[PDB]
């Protein structure tokens, strides 16, 4: 029977300094025991000085990051180009994820 | 399951319902009142699935109250029990049925007689001198079949219950933390606050 999920491996890491923050991830993408790419970026600059990564099932990870970026775009449209504070972005991400509470984005995301 | 007993004596109906509310490994409460008053002379006890139990009872209560205010009249116990049976019979064939069993005790002011109704979640209704839900009947029906008399006084009935509750506390595996008893008669509904040692 059809299984909508998959696992593309990968590992990400986020550390917050005092006046800086870093988000790192390896660039390997896999399927079972095969390598799909040795360099497929997984951490993205989403604008407004926010970096994000949705690790796990790549298709879901991509849909999420793409959806969030678009969310930032409309935030500017709807609120006079106001900068999206990272705390605000986080609450936004929560609603994006919980929106699929009964068919989850199979990813662990960090910003 | 929880204990849900009902006895119909000469001039009233008595309802005894366990006070324990258990969730998995722990007994969360030991003072739970598994009953709702539908109208001044009609009481309903209930047992069954976790959330559906109270949701259903409060839903029925709201409806009977709305009827009372619209008509400025109190439906007969028979009428109230038919309304409730129909509700459950709808539920049984719906997407997610209410898994609730009930005892409806009321004093019919027009006939001047007490009445006890037993209705399971399938919408099965029957009128009885006494009844129960779950395993309760398995332990108490032989006692009631024996000592029950149509002319018993509210006092004799409360004694017959005590006997029933004792057999339950002896042979039943679960600790239901005793029962809360209530009387329904020509004057309304009152709670026997002294059954913890009557």
């Amino acid at each position: 029977q059809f299984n909508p999920y998959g696992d593309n491996g990968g590992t990400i890491l986020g550390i917050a300094g005092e006046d800086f923050a870093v988000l790192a991830g390896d660039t390997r993408n896999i399927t079972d025991y095969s390598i799909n790419s040795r360099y497929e970026p997984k951490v993205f600059d989403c604008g407004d000085n926010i970096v994000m990564s949705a690790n796990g099932f790549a298709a879901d990870g991509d849909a999420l990051v793409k959806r969030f970026k678009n969310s930032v775009k409309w935030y500017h449209f709807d609120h006079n180009d106001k900068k999206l504070s990272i705390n605000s972005a986080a609450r936004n991400i929560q609603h994006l994820l919980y929106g699929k509470r009964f068919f989850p984005y199979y990813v662990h995301t960090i910003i | 399951m929880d204990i849900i007993l009902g006895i119909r004596v000469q001039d009233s109906v008595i309802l005894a319902s366990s006070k324990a509310v258990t969730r998995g490994i722990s007994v969360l409460k030991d003072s739970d009142d598994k009953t709702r008053q539908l109208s001044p002379h009609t009481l309903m006890s209930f047992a069954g699935e976790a959330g559906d139990t109270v949701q259903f009872a409060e839903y029925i209560q709201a409806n009977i109250q709305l009827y009372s205010i619209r008509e400025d009249y109190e439906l007969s116990p028979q009428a109230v029990s038919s309304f409730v049976r129909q509700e459950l019979a709808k539920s049984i064939r719906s997407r997610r049925p209410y898994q609730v069993n009930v005892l409806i005790g009321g004093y019919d002011k027009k006939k001047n007689k007490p009445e006890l109704y037993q209705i399971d979640y399938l919408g099965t209704k029957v009128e009885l001198p006494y009844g129960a839900h779950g395993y309760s009947g398995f332990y108490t029906f032989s006692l009631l079949d024996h000592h029950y008399r149509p002319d018993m006084t509210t006092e004799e009935g409360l004694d017959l219950l005590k006997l029933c509750v004792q057999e339950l506390e002896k042979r039943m595996p679960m600790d239901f933390k005793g029962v809360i008893v209530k009387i329904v008669d020509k004057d309304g509904i009152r709670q026997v606050d002294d059954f913890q040692a009557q």
Binding site: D78, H79, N80, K82, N87, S88, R91, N92, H95 | -
Partner: protein, 242 residues
């Protein structure tokens, strides 16, 4: 007959213009925005002495940093206020922050033109335009204190001061002269209380008029009679003082 969304030969929407007429008949409402907060005042205008003047609510809270005054068919404002409060609360739930005053206004105005008997653009089910205008005032980090005028047309303007209701043309003229960039909250209060007195049919007292303001520090507050009564007295004095 004629559609409720028909254009006049001059290029105006009949129902919207007639809506504006009904608003002219409403009780006066005035808003003054200063760098120390925004003041909002309204004429209660009870219709009988037996009416309990304090059950007249023409200044409501949208959120802690937004409040508004209405003028016209006030019953039509109930759902607008409801939409406004929901919008502000909802925004907070989604972004863990305060909704910008402008954004909140824009949201309300979005209901404005949602009327008609089958306008091909969505599902605008509302038989007629709203018969009430609103003065929306609040504060937010990006643009500070703001005053907005929201009409049944759907358009909304920002003002430093604005008057709507029966005596708005006269009162606006007043505001024209009286307003300046360095007004203080105290001044604005007195100033609003003064213009209300000029246009109101009745003699302004703390029972037929109501003041309120919104400051970054304490948010939107409605002045209780006692507080206003004193401001009245203080006004009568400074006026008799020349």
């Amino acid at each position: 007959d004629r559609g409720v969304s028909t254009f006049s030969p001059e290029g105006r929407l009949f129902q919207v213009e007639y809506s504006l007429e009904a608003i002219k008949l409403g009780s006066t409402a005035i808003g003054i925005a200063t760098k120390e907060g925004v003041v909002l005042g309204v004429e209660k205008r009870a219709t009988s002495p037996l009416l309990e003047s304090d059950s007249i609510e023409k200044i409501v809270e949208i959120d802690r940093h937004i409040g508004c005054a209405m003028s016209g068919l006030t019953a039509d404002a109930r759902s607008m206020i409801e939409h406004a409060r929901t919008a502000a609360v909802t925004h907070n739930l989604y972004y863990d922050e305060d909704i910008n005053v402008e954004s909140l206004t824009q949201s309300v105005c979005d209901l404005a033109l949602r009327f008609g008997e089958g306008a091909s653009g969505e599902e605008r089910l509302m038989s007629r335009p709203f018969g009430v205008a609103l003065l929306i005032a609040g504060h937010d980090a990006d643009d500070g204190y703001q005053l907005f005028h929201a009409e049944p047309s759907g358009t909304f303007y920002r003002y430093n001061a604005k008057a709507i209701g029966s005596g708005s043309e006269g009162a606006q003229a007043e505001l024209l002269n009286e307003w300046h960039s360095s007004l203080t909250l105290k001044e604005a209060e007195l100033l609003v209380l003064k213009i209300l007195k000029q246009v109101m049919e009745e003699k302004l007292d703390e029972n037929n008029a109501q003041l309120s303001c919104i400051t970054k520090q304490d948010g939107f507050k409605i002045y209780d009679n006692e507080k206003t009564a004193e401001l009245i007295k203080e006004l009568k004095e400074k006026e008799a003082a020349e």
